[PDB]
Amino acid sequence: GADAAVIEKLEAGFKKLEAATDCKSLLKKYLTKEVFDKLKDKKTSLGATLLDVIQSGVENLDSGVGIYAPDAEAYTLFAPLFDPIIEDYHVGFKQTDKHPNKDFGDVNSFVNVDPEGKFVISTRVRCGRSMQGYPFNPMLTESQYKEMEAKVSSTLSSLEGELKGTYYPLTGMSKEVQQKLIDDHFLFKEGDRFLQAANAMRYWPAGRGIYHNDNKTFLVWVNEEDHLRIISMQMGGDLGQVFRRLTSAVNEIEKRIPFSHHDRLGFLTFCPTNLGTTVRASVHIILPKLAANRAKLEEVAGKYNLQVAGIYDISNKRRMGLTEFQAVKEMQDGILELIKIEKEM
Numbered sequence: 001g002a003d004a005a006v007i008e009k010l011e012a013g014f015k016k017l018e019a020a021t022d023c024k025s026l027l028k029k030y031l032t033k034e035v036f037d038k039l040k041d042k043k044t045s046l047g048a049t050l051l052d053v054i055q056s057g058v059e060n061l062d063s064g065v066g067i068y069a070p071d072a073e074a075y076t077l078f079a080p081l082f083d084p085i086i087e088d089y090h091v092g093f094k095q096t097d098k099h100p101n102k103d104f105g106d107v108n109s110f111v112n113v114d115p116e117g118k119f120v121i122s123t124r125v126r127c128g129r130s131m132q133g134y135p136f137n138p139m140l141t142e143s144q145y146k147e148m149e150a151k152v153s154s155t156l157s158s159l160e161g162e163l164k165g166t167y168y169p170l171t172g173m174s175k176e177v178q179q180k181l182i183d184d185h186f187l188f189k190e191g192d193r194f195l196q197a198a199n200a201m202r203y204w205p206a207g208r209g210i211y212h213n214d215n216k217t218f219l220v221w222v223n224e225e226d227h228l229r230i231i232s233m234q235m236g237g238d239l240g241q242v243f244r245r246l247t248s249a250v251n252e253i254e255k256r257i258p259f260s261h262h263d264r265l266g267f268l269t270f271c272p273t274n275l276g277t278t279v280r281a282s283v284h285i286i287l288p289k290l291a292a293n294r295a296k297l298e299e300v301a302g303k304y305n306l307q308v309a310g311i312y313d314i315s316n317k318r319r320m321g322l323t324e325f326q327a328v329k330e331m332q333d334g335i336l337e338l339i340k341i342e343k344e345m
Contacts, residue, residue, distance in 0.1 A: 001041060001042055001043025001049070002040065002041045002042065002043050002049040002050065002051070003049075006049050006051050007040055007041055009051055009055075010036075010040045010049075010050055010051050010054075011040070013051070013054060013055070013058035014031065014033075014036050014040075016058055016061070017031060017057075017058060017061075018033075020061045023061045023062075024064075025057050025061065025062075025063045025064060025065065025066035026064065026065045026066060026067075026085045026088055026089060027054055027057035027058075027063065027065065027066030027067050027081075027085070028057075028061075028066070029085075029088070030081055030084045030085050030088070031054065031081060035080050035081055036050075038080065039077075039078055039080060039081060042077055042078070043077075044070070044071055044073040044074055044077050045073060046071050046073065046135055046139055047139070048070035048071045048073070048074050048077075048135075048138065048139055050078060050081075052070035052074070052138045052139070052199070053067050053068065053069065053070060053074055053078050053081065053082075054066065054067050054081075055197055055198065055199070056068055056194055056195075056197040056198035058197075059193070059197035060193055060194050060197055063194060065085065065089060065271070065272065065273055067081065067082070067085060067272065068136070068137075068138070068198045068200065068270055068271055068272075069082070069136055069268070069269070069270055069271075069272065070135065070136055070137075070138035070139045070199075071135035071136055071138075071139045072130075072135070072136075072260055072262070072268050075262065075265060075268065075272075082272060083095075085272060086265070086272050086275065086320070089272065089273060090273075090275070090276065090318075090319060090320040090321065091318075092318060092320075092321050093276070093320040093321035094321070097264075097321050098263060098264045099262075099264060099265055099266035099275070099276045099277075099320050099321060100266075100321075100322070100323050102267075102323075102324065103323040103324060103325055104243075104247045104323075104324050104325055105323060105324070105325025105326075105329075106325070107240065107243050107244045107247050107325075108240065108244070109240070110239045110240035110243055110244075110328060110329070110332055111238075111239065111240060111332065111336075112236070112237045112238040112239065112240070113237040113239055113283065113332060113335045113336055113339065114236070114237035114283075114285075114339060115237065117235075117236050117237065119237075119285050119286055119287060119339050119342065120236060120237040120283045120284070120285050120335070120339075121235065121283075121284040121285065121286065121311065122233060122234065122235050122236070122283070122284045123233065123234060123236065123237055123238065123239050123242045123281075123282070123283050123284075124231060124232065124233035124242065124280075124281070124282050124283075124284075125231070125232050125233075125239075125242050125243050125246045125279065125280070125281040125282075125328060126229060126230070126231045126232075126279070126280045126281075126282075127229075127230050127231075127246065127250060127267075127277070127278045127279050127280075127324075128225075128226040128228065128229050128230070128267065128269050128274050128278040129226065129227060129228040129230065129250075129257075129259045129260070129267055129269075129278070130226055130227050130228075130259060130260035130267070130268050130269060130270070131148060131151070131152075131227045131228065131257055131258070131259065131260065132257075132258040132259055132260050134148055134227060134260075136226075136227075136269075136270040137195075137198065137199065137200035137201070137202070137223075137225075137270055138198060138199040138200065138202075140202070140207075142202075142203045142206055142207075144207075145203055145206050145207025145208075145223060146206060146207050148207055148222075148223065148227060149169065149206075149207040149208070149209055149222055149223065151256075151257060152209070152220075152222050152227075152228065152257065153167045153169070153209065153211075153222075154256075155253060155256045155257055156211045156220060156253070158256075159213075159249070159252065162213065162215060162217075162218075162245065163213050163218055163245075163248070163249055163252070164213060164214055165211055165212050165213035165214055165218065166211065166212065166214075167209060167210075167211045168181065168209055168210045168211070169205075169208070169209040170204075170205035170208040170209055170210070171205050171206055171208070173205075181210060184212070184216060186210055186212055186216075186219055187210065188208075188210070188221050188224045190204050190205070191204075191224075191225070195225065198270075200225065200270065207222070207223050208221075208222060208223045208224065209221075209222040209223070210222070217232060217233060217234045217242075217245060218231070218232055218233075218245060218246075218249060219231045219232075219233065225270055225271065225274075226269050226270050226274065228253075228257075230246065230249060230250055230253070231246070232245040232246035232249065237283065239281070239328065239331070239332050243281070243328055247324075265320075266278070266320060273319070274319065275319060275320055276319040276320030276321065276322075277319055277320070277322065277323065277324045277327050278319065279316065279319065279324050279327045279328065280315050280316065280319075281315060281316050281327060281328045281331040281332075282313050282314060282315035282316075282331065283313070283314055283315075283331075283335055284311055284312070284313055285311070285312055285313075285314055285335070285338075285339075286310055286311055286312075287312065287338060287339075287342045288310055288342075289342050289345060290338065290341055290342045291310060291312070297312075300338060300341060301314060301334070301338065302317075304330070304333070304334030304337055304338065305317045305318050305330050305334060306330075306331065306334040306335070306338070314331075314334075314335065314338070315331060316328070316330045316331040316334070317330075318330060
């Protein structure tokens with residue numbers, strides 16, 4: 001299916017990976033000559049080639065992963081590459097596993113992990129969604145970016161009550177508005193070299209926008225990396241409040257905007273690191289004792305399936321092979337334990 005010129009670029013890219021002897025990407029690890037040869041000329045029905053999958057990891061050798069999905073079909077056609085990378089990245093999500101269908105569980109059971117506000121500055125839960133019927137960044141037309149944005153804007157502008165707010169398209173945005181959004185940490189910028197090389201930012205900023213509610217506890221990014229990135233946040237540690245709000249918002253949006261979903265992989269996303277639940281529950285937290293020795297903070301976080309990114313963003317590491325409820329509960333329980341460790345000792 002792939003054009004001769006594409007195959008030529010793929011052969012060059014393969015040569016670069018195999019040689020890049022110090023490259024540690026999952027792309028280099030799993031793009032063996034056998035896998036490469038069997039996939040290099042293949043193309044999805046919409047026109048996505050292996051180059052639309054691997055180009056970013058070829059261009060950025062320092063990528064951790066190095067592949068993106070150009071359309072949903074790519075996860076199937078290029079499964080011999082996606083599947084082992086997904087297995088390797090999403091530790092615990094086994095070959096024979098299917099990611100569970102959506103289950104937010106009892107969103108009344110989550111607690112405030114730091115009622116006194118001694119450690120946790122803020123709590124956030126983010127998820128991502130792709131809109132049913134639309135391909136992912138690389139395969140989107142300018143017209144699709146715009147149509148998608150109009151749908152999303154209409155839907156979000158319809159939100160009432162606590163979720164009521166304002167939509168801001170990036171196109172034509174004034175400097176004064178940019179600064180106001182920056183001051184609230186609500187603005188996103190044009191993608192970095194990883195996204196650029198994935199052809200994820202074509203037509204920027206057409207079809208990109210930001211929504212937030214009046215209370216500044218709910219934020220949506222439209223066409224930043226995924227079609228939708230939906231975030232609930234507030235100061236302090238009340239993970240229950242944060243998660244309750246997120247789930248209400250996602251369930252309401254879904255009524256007008258159905259989502260792309262896969263029986264095995266869960267919610268489909270542009271980057272395979274965001275599959276499954278897509279959920280990133282995090283605290284911005286200060287743990288000065290446990291830090292001090294970065295190595296040690298890492299070990300303890302890892303033990304509780306947390307990821308660390310003197311203020312740390314500490315989140316659930318697991319995305320696939322557990323429910324949303326379970327992913328948020330892993331963050332909650334892990335943060336409760338880190339706080340205990342910090343206090344003691």
